[PDB]
C-alpha cells in the first residue's frame, strides 16, 4: 500500500495546523503548516481521493519512491494521513520556490545557473547510485528552501532500475525535456535524466526549453529526428559545452552526474547555495507586485 500511511485514528486536522495555502497543482492543494506535535514546519499536500482516479497511481508512486530516498538533495516525506476522502501528504517544506519560479523576475547569471545545476547534479548522483531514475527533471521540479538549498521534487513517474529490470521502456515525462530514447521507448536508464538535465540547463539560461513554442506532438518527432539542441546566445563556452555534453543523441555517450560535477562550467562558476537567497528575495518582491 502507501508507505507512511497512518490510520484514520490520526486526525490530520488535529495533528497539523495549516498556516496558509501555498500552491495548487493538478492533484490538489499545497499548504504550509506546522506539525503540532514537534512544532516543525512542513508542506502539506491535500488530495481528494473521491474527486480523482487515474491521478492516484501517480500519487502513490511518488510517495513510494520518496519513502525510499534519504538524501538532503531529495525532498523528505513524513507520512500520509486520511480524513474522510482527503489524503494529506506531509513533506519537507521548501519555501524558496521552484527554479522555474525564480526565472519569473528576469534571467539568472551563470553563477546562479551553475549553483543550481550543481545541486541538481548532487541529487541525480544520489538517485542514480540508488538505481533510481527521476524521469521528470525540469526547472519546475527543482525546489528551493528559503536559505537557498536545492532539492529534487515530483518523482511521480520516477523509475526503479532494479535487479530483474536494468532498463525501462515507459513513455514517461514532459515532452520538451524528454530524451530521444525515452520518446522512442528504447531500453533506457539514468542517462535519460542526464539529457533532461541538459534541457533544464538551456531552460535556466533562456527561460524555456527548446521547441517550447511548438505543439507537443510535433516535438514528438523532432527530438529523435533532429540533431540535439545547443545553447545559443551570449553564454560562456563552458556553459555551452556543458549543455553539449548532456545532449548527446546516444545515451551511453552522456557522462554521469558525478563526472558533470567536475565539468569546468561547474568548477569555475558554482558558489555557495546561500548566495541563492538573493534570487529567492527577488522572486518574493516580484510576486508581491503581481
What 3-state class would DSSP assign to 93?
coil
| Residue whose C-alpha cell is 539568472 | 108
Question: What are the binding residues for ATP?
Answer: 45
Report CA 88 to chain centroid distance, whole Å. 21
Contact 80, 89 (CB under 8 A): yes
| Residue whose C-alpha cell is 530514447 | 181
Quick one: CATH architecture of 1-93?
2-Layer Sandwich (3.30)
Report the half-sphere exposure of 32 (CA within 13 A, side-chain side).
Answer: 12
| Residue whose C-alpha cell is 507512511 | 4
Please count the residues of the chain.
290
| Helix spans in 68-189 (H) | 99-103, 110-129, 180-183
- Whose CA is closest to 119, among 142, 153, 97? 142
Domain locations along the chain = 1-93, 94-290
Report CA 95 to chain centroid distance, whole Å. 15
Q: Which CATH class is domain 94-290?
A: mainly alpha
Q: Checking phi first, is residue 64 left (phi over 0); if not, alpha (psi -120 to 50) or beta?
A: alpha
| Helix spans in 110-235 (H) | 110-129, 180-183, 190-206, 216-225
Strand duo 77-83 + 28-35: pairing: unpaired
Q: How far is CA 56 from CA 6, 65, 108, in A?
A: 17, 14, 36
Annotation says 101 is catalytic? no
- Which residues does 262 contact at the CB level (< 8 Å), separation at least 6? none
Give the span between the Cα atoms of 80 and 3, in whole angstroms.
Answer: 8
Q: How far is CA 101 from CA 56, 96, 281, in A?
A: 26, 9, 11
- The experimental method is X-ray
Nearest 5°: CA angle at 184, between 206 and 226? 45
- Which residues does 267 contact at the CB level (< 8 Å), separation at least 6? none
Query: Which residues on neighbouring strands pair with residue 16, listed in sequence order?
Result: 35
| Residue whose C-alpha cell is 519569473 | 104
Q: Name the active-site residue from 54, 58, 109, 136.
A: 136
Letter string b/e over residues 88-120, b meaning 16 or more CB atoms within 10 A of that residue's CB: bbbbbbbebbbbbbbbebeebebebbbbbbbbb
To one decimal, the resolution in angstroms is 2.0
Query: What are the start-end ranges of the E strands in 28-67?
Result: 28-35, 40-48
Give the span between the Cα atoms of 152 and 252, in whole angstroms.
Answer: 24
- Which residues does 54 contact at the CB level (< 8 Å), separation at least 6? none
Amino acid at each position: 500500500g502507501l508507505p507512511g500511511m497512518q490510520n484514520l485514528k490520526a486526525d490530520p486536522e488535529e495533528l497539523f495546523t495549516k498556516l496558509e495555502k501555498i500552491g495548487k497543482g493538478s492533484f490538489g492543494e499545497v499548504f504550509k503548516g506546522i506539525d503540532n506535535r514537534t512544532q516543525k514546519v512542513v508542506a502539506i499536500k491535500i488530495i481528494d481521493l473521491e474527486e480523482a482516479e487515474d491521478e492516484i497511481e501517480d500519487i502513490q508512486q511518488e510517495i513510494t519512491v520518496l519513502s525510499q530516498c534519504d538524501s538532503p538533495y531529495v525532498t523528505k516525506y513524513y507520512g500520509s494521513y486520511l480524513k474522510d476522502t482527503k489524503l494529506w501528504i506531509i513533506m519537507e517544506y521548501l519555501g524558496g520556490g521552484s527554479a522555474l519560479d525564480l526565472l519569473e523576475p528576469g534571467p539568472l547569471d551563470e553563477t546562479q545557473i551553475a549553483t543550481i545545476l550543481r545541486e541538481i547534479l548532487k541529487g541525480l548522483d544520489y538517485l542514480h547510485s540508488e538505481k533510481k531514475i527521476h524521469r521528470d527533471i525540469k526547472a519546475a521540479n527543482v525546489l528551493l528552501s528559503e536559505h537557498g538549498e536545492v532539492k529534487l521534487a515530483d518523482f511521480g513517474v520516477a523509475g526503479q532500475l532494479t535487479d530483474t529490470q536494468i532498463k525501462r521502456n515507459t513513455f514517461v515525462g514532459t515532452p520538451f525535456w524528454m530524451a530521444p530514447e525515452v520518446i522512442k521507448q528504447s531500453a533506457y536508464d539514468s542517462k535519460a535524466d542526464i539529457w533532461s538535465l541538459g534541457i533544464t540547463a538551456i531552460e535556466l539560461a533562456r527561460g524555456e526549453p527548446p521547441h517550447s513554442e511548438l505543439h507537443p506532438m510535433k516535438v514528438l518527432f523532432l527530438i529523435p529526428k533532429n540533431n540535439p539542441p545547443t545553447l545559443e546566445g551570449n553564454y560562456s563556452k563552458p556553459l555551452k559545452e556543458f549543455v553539449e555534453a548532456c545532449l548527446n543523441k546516444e545515451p551511453s555517450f552522456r557522462p554521469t552526474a558525478k563526472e558533470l560535477l567536475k565539468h569546468k562550467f561547474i568548477l569555475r562558476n558554482a558558489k555557495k547555495t546561500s548566495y541563492l537567497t538573493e534570487l529567492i528575495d527577488r522572486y518574493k518582491r516580484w510576486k508581491a507586485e503581481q
